[PDB]
Amino acid sequence: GAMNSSNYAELFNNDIKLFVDDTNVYRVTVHKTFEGNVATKAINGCIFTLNPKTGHLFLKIIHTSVWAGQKRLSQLAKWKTAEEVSALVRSLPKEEQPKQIIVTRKAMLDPLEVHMLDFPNIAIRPTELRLPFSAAMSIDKLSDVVMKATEPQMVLFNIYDDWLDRISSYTAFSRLTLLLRALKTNEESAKMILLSDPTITIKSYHLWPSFTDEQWITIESQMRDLILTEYGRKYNV
Amino acid sequence: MNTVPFTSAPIEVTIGIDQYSFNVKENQPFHGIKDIPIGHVHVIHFQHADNSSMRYGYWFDCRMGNFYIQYDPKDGLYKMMEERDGAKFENIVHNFKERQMMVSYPKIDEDDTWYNLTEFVQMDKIRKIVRKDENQFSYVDSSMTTVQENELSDPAHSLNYTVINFKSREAIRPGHEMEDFLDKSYYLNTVMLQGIFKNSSNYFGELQFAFLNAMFFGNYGSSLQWHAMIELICSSATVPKHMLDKLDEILYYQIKTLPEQYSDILLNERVWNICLYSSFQKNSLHNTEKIMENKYPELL
């Protein structure tokens, strides 16, 4: 059933699985109309589909054209997510198809289950983890490809860069979740921490800077400090 | 008016006939039920005084043969049987009547309750849901499982209700996933009505039969079937107007008849709230909504 702290190691076993986060699929700006009413303008979105073992990110860009002349968009967004994930699974060879898909939001279970009836052996699961994948659009290179898209497009990333050469997927996922948590809690502070030292760059084929093992420990420290500070602010404690 | 004679009543038992019920004492000189209205299916049902576990009973139609009850002290139950000798049967029934050892089916002239609960129910359809083709009557009890319950284990003793599953390839057309899941009209009208049931009468007959097995035997799988068949109509944006008007009447008599004390185990809160307040048909069941709100406001 549901995925939690108790069965955390399962993410890093040799059964292919994907996380699906739909929190950036339907995105709007709210503004005043000339008559002083309120209207939304949709902007480009993305499905965040991640293999937590390999770091392979299937970023399906959702172009605003998919909403044209549709009603009940927040409901359609769940079904469109489920359609795109099912299209992605069908496009993979059999031996690459996931044995499980974990949705970060319970509203995705029925839409994905209905779209995957052809795949009765693929388990659709919720999670009790509060994963910060919503912050994916705080990664500059992912944000840039989403906002520049002029049509529907799938872009393939490794969200771990070359980390798996040096650390396990357990540790790579912990680093990713801490970076995203930070970016989600205080984006300005988080991005300042990541780029304050101009000598450390982001390779053209990477998302994050090229930190030595020692520099990651320091970065990881500064991100934990940012999170606890902001927590003592939010809650005055 | 037809008669179901009893050889005897060797064990103390509560006997139901349709919506009526009578206590018979161990070895009480009880020889059966007379004045049974011709033209309807009937159910004769039993709960032993010594084991209120296993309610059980027999669906029959008196037009299809001469039926009697006889206790089997080996299998420990009242069994329905057919008498093929028409003269032996008439002679037996006449003696017991003359000696007034039979209770009279106690129909009030004004009272259409049993007709209203059984309008679409036909013995030939019951015999396809309950398979035992060597008898013209059908045995049901509390513990019998449905074909659908068995998928999720003796097939001979199962209730063969039509399988309804909202998250099934049958229910959902490829490329119409969101449409078919949020509006089940395709599933109701093309798959079930045109495809499997052939008309709304057979659909209502199975719905009514499932309710009565739920109420008279507390058959859990029958209760699930009755709720699924309601929910498939309520969740469809497109239903013939005559089906909605008839569903409102059907459900009205079912809610009116349910023992007040069993609402907690026989009524599914989620399905009813959804059907009366959220569904496409939320404004189409006036009689049902009014009796539910006045009789079971707690459930909602």
Residue A193: CATH number of its domain: 1.20.80.40
| Angle of the B220-234 helix axis to the B200-217 helix axis, nearest 10 | 140
Asked whether residue A201 falls in the same domain as residue A212, the answer is yes
Q: Does B167 touch chain A (CB under 8 A)?
A: yes
Experimental method: X-ray
- Inform me whether the C-beta atom of residue A72 falls under 8 Å from chain B C-beta atoms: no
**A88 and A32 within one domain:** yes
A172 and A154: one domain? no
Q: Could you tell me how many CB contacts below 8 A there are between chain A and chain B?
A: 22
Q: Does A109 touch chain B (CB under 8 A)?
A: no
Range of the domain at A69: 9-163
One DSSP character per residue, B10-76 reads: -S-EEEEETTEEEEE-TT----EEEEEPTTS-EEEEEEESS--S--EEEEE-GGG-EEEEEEETTTT
Does one domain contain both A137 and A175?
no
Longest Cα–Cα distance in chain A: 59
In Å, how far is B224's CA from the nearest CA of chain A? Answer: 20
- Do A194 and A102 lie in one domain? The reply is no
Query: Which candidate, B263, B250, B136, places its Cα nearest to that of B203?
Result: B250
If asked whether residues A107 and A202 sit together in one domain, one would say no
- What is the domain partition of chain B in residue ranges? 1-143, 144-300
Last residue of a domain, one of A103, A135, A163: A163
* PDB resolution in Å: 1.7
Phi and psi, residue B77, nearest 5°: -150, 160
A45 inside 8 A of chain B by CB: no
* Structure-token match 């093992």, residue found: A213
A110 burial (CB, 10 Å; 0-12 / 13-18 / 19+) is: middle
A74 found inside a domain? yes
Q: Does the CB of B293 have a partner CB in chain A at under 8 Å?
A: no
Could A111 and B172 be called an inter-chain contact, meaning their C-beta atoms sit closer than 8 Å?
no
The residue among A163, A194, A221 that closes a domain is A163
What 3-state DSSP class applies to A60?
strand
Residue A4 lies in a domain: no
Domain B144-300 has CATH 1.20.1630.10: no
Nearest CA-CA distance, residue A200 and chain B, Å: 48
In total, chain A counts a number of residues equal to: 237
Separation in Å, CA of B291 to nearest CA in chain A: 33
Task: Name every chain A residue with its beta carbon within 8 A of the beta carbon of B176.
Answer: none
| Within-domain flag for A228 | yes
Instruction: Report which secondary-structure segment, H or E, holds A28.
Output: strand A27-32
CA distance B184 to chain A (A): 13
Strand partners, B36: B2
Cβ of A114 within 8 Å of Cβ of B168? The answer is no
Q: A3 lies in a domain?
A: no
**Secondary structure E strands in chain B:** 2-5, 13-17, 20-24, 32-36, 42-48, 56-60, 66-72, 77-83, 103-104, 138-141
Task: Specify whether domain B1-143 bears CATH 2.60.34.20.
Answer: yes
Q: Which of residues 114-153 of A touch B (CB under 8 A)?
A: 114-115, 117-118
Asked if residue A144 and residue A209 are part of one domain, the reply reads no
d(CA B296, CA A154): 53
| Lateral strand order in the sheet of A153-158 | A123-125, A100-103, A17-21, A45-50, A56-62, A153-158
